[PDB]
């Protein structure tokens, strides 16, 4: 007999097909059957009339590396329907690095002494021994590798340093990492050359992993950064994933037309993917950057002056008699939210066929960007239903089947017999992001229940206590 059947709802199967009335039966960690299951014995037949049963949402871009260890409930994600997270993005991974004061932006993962894993395998073992509520597909970050190996980050790595970093990356992949990410936009890797990145990432071909990247620049020089990324992909001969695609700064508004055209052209000749979050503001370390600081900027946390959390940086700066750019050093380390994108570009990028959804949530932040709690329902409700940017099945595909295919997460991302029972039950009419910039931790509406490997992890608007997630391999 099946353990349970989600009966009477509409199945949106993750393959980008209009929903159809069908039941979903689960046995253990697997979807046993899909269709009219009235004739199948089941221990429970759960009524989900009026709801959609879809595959669990796979987050396209997280910084949950440490959150998985410290807050196993993973409430910000499971409350949104997320069942799997891709970690170790933008060159930032929790492991391998034993360091009491890692360089920003690695601090976005730190709760205080969190960087304690000398080997990547140590980190994966900790996850497997105390599993989180969601599955984890983990990448190793090139900036973490530089921090672990280089005595001086302000220059290109020597061959010896490249050898040490490549060895750590190869061990990580052998242990289960699904790829390597870079973020040369950030200080720890700003001096890394294209060749350094290529040499450290060589093992991806041998292990069948992916190359993910926070491009070197996402503004004035985004074409050069895209070309660098495509070149790295061709040299590595592995799939590339462009993280949180955007065009930032007023001088670049509207340029999504140009960037998406370059990406679409590259996709015709090499393997390229991209993801994005559904908002007009970014968030990361507080950084002295003319473009990030051009517009409205809010502080998310601040080490030297904790009282600044939540404040408007222009006010802080002006009261200190400085521009935002000049006041930044005295406030570091800190985090911020930057209103530097334009709605038409965000919509064009979200609607671009291949764009996967990634929240880019920064879970340890005191006053976080709402994308941490509202990304997926914002796409399903606001964008799909309310604005009609894409039909619901396409919005679901962009956070399920597409993502599972690009990251190579076998037997996940689709409601198919034999696949793992990572599932979401949501009300298409009411699903909505409730988190706002003012109240960024509000739980989404319309998420009825969420299942990971067949076990309910979210029910009655609460974590069930099921630590059902698994560390995944490509």
Residue set of the binding site for Zn(2+): 61, 63, 71, 90, 111, 170, 195, 199, 207, 214, 237, 244, 315, 319, 360, 382, 386, 467
- Map the footprint of Zn ion across residues 24-63, applying CB under 5 A: none
Q: How far is the CB of 37 from Zn ion (least distance, A)?
A: 43
DSSP 252: G
The residue within the footprint of Zn ion, chosen from 51, 72, 77, 214 (CB under 5 A), is 214
Residues 6+ apart with CB under 8 A from 115: 94, 95, 97, 98, 99, 100, 102, 106, 109
| Binding region for Zn ion (CB under 5 A) out of 95-103, 207-215, 315-323, 345-353 | 207-215
CB-count burial class (<10 Å; 0-12, 13-18, 19+) for 296 = middle
* Contact indicator for 78, 457 with CB cutoff of 8 Å: yes
In degrees rounded to 5, what are phi and psi of residue 163? -60, -45
Instruction: Name which of 400, 391, 429 is nearest 9 in CA terms.
Output: 429
Residue 445 three-state SS? strand
Q: What's the CA gap between 194 and 231, in Å, rounded?
A: 9
Q: Which is nearer to Zn ion, 340 or 415 (CB)?
A: 340
The shares of helix, strand and coil residues in the chain, as percent rounded to the nearest 5, are 30, 20, 45
Q: Which is nearer to Zn ion, 214 or 324 (CB)?
A: 214
Integer angstrom CA distances of residue 455 from 64, 89, 126, 423:
21, 27, 21, 9
Q: How far is the CB of 85 from Zn ion (least distance, A)?
A: 15
Q: Which is nearer to Zn ion, 211 or 420 (CB)?
A: 211
| Binding region for Zn ion (CB under 5 A) out of 132-140, 213-221, 384-392, 404-412 | 213-221
Residues tagged in the binding site annotation: 61, 63, 71, 90, 111, 170, 195, 199, 207, 214, 237, 244, 315, 319, 360, 382, 386, 467
Buried b / exposed e over 84-97, threshold 16 CB at 10 Å, is: bbbbbbbbbbbbbb
Kindly report the three-state secondary structure assignment for every residue of 394-427.
Answer: HHHHCCCHHHHHHHCCCCCCCCCCCCECCEEEEC
Q: Which is nearer to Zn ion, 9 or 183 (CB)?
A: 183
292 binds Zn ion (CB under 5 A): no
Q: How far is the CB of 342 from Zn ion (least distance, A)?
A: 19
Sketch the per residue contact string, 297 through 336, with Zn ion: x for CB under 5 A, - otherwise.
----------------------------------------
Can you say how many angstroms the Cα of residue 240 is from the centroid of all Cα atoms in its chain?
Answer: 15
Q: How far is the CB of 270 from Zn ion (least distance, A)?
A: 22
Sketch the per residue contact string, 66 through 95, with Zn ion: x for CB under 5 A, - otherwise.
------------------------x-----
Q: Which is nearer to Zn ion, 56 or 103 (CB)?
A: 103
Q: How far is the CB of 215 from Zn ion (least distance, A)?
A: 9
Number of residues that bind Zn ion (CB under 5 A): 2
User: Could you list the residues that contact Zn ion (CB under 5 A)?
Assistant: 90, 214
């Amino acid at each position: 007999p099946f353990d349970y059947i989600l009966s009477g709802g509409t199945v949106i199967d993750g393959t980008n097909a209009p929903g159809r009335l069908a039941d979903v039966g689960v046995r253990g960690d697997r979807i046993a059957a899909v269709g009219d299951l009235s004739a199948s014995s089941a221990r429970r037949r759960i009524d989900v009339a009026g709801k959609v049963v879809s595959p669990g949402f796979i987050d396209s871009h997280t910084h949950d590396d440490n959150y998985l260890l410290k807050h196993r409930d993973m409430t910000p994600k499971i409350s949104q329907g997320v069942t799997t997270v891709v970690t170790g993005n933008c060159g930032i991974s929790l492991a391998p690095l034993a360091h009491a004061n890692p360089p920003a932006p690695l601090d976005l993962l730190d709760e205080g002494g969190s960087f304690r894993f000398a080997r990547f395998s140590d980190y994966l073992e900790a996850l497997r021994a105390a599993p989180p509520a969601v599955n984890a597909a983990c990448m190793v970050g090139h900036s973490t590798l530089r921090a672990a190996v280089m005595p001086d980050l302000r220059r290109e790595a020597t061959a010896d340093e490249i050898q040490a970093m490549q060895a750590l990356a190869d061990d990580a992949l052998a242990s289960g990492a699904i790829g390597i990410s870079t973020g040369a936009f950030y200080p720890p890797a700003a001096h890394a050359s294209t060749e350094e990145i290529i040499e450290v990432c060589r093992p991806l071909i041998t292990h069948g992993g992916v190359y993910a990247t926070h491009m070197r620049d996402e503004g004035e020089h985004i074409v050069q950064a895209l070309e660098e990324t495509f070149r790295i992909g061709r040299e590595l001969d592995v799939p590339v994933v462009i993280s949180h695609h955007k065009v930032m700064g007023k001088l670049n508004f509207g340029r999504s037309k140009e960037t998406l055209a370059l990406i679409e052209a590259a996709m015709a000749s090499q393997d390229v993917s991209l993801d994005a979050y559904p908002y007009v503001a970014g968030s990361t370390m507080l950084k002295q950057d003319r473009v990030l600081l051009a517009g409205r900027t809010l502080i998310t946390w601040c080490k030297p002056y904790p009282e600044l959390s939540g404040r408007d940086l222009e006010e802080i700066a002006a009261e200190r008699g400085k521009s935002k750019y000049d006041v930044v050093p005295e406030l570091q380390p800190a985090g911020a939210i930057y209103f530097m994108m334009d709605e038409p570009d965000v919509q064009r990028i979200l609607a671009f066929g291949p764009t996967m959804i990634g929240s880019d949530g920064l879970p340890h932040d005191e006053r976080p960007h709402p994308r941490l709690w509202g990304t997926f329902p914002r796409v399903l409700g606001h964008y799909s239903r309310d604005l009609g940017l894409f039909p619901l099945e396409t919005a679901v595909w962009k956070m399920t089947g597409l993502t599972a295919a690009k990251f190579g997460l076998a037997e996940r991302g689709q409601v198919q017999p034999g696949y793992y029972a990572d599932l979401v039950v949501f009300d298409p009419a009411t699903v909505a992001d409730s988190a706002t910039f003012e109240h960024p931790t509000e739980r989404a509406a319309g998420i009825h229940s969420v299942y990971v490997n067949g076990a309910a992890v979210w029910e009655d608007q609460s974590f069930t206590g099921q630590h059902a997630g698994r560390v995944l391999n490509r």
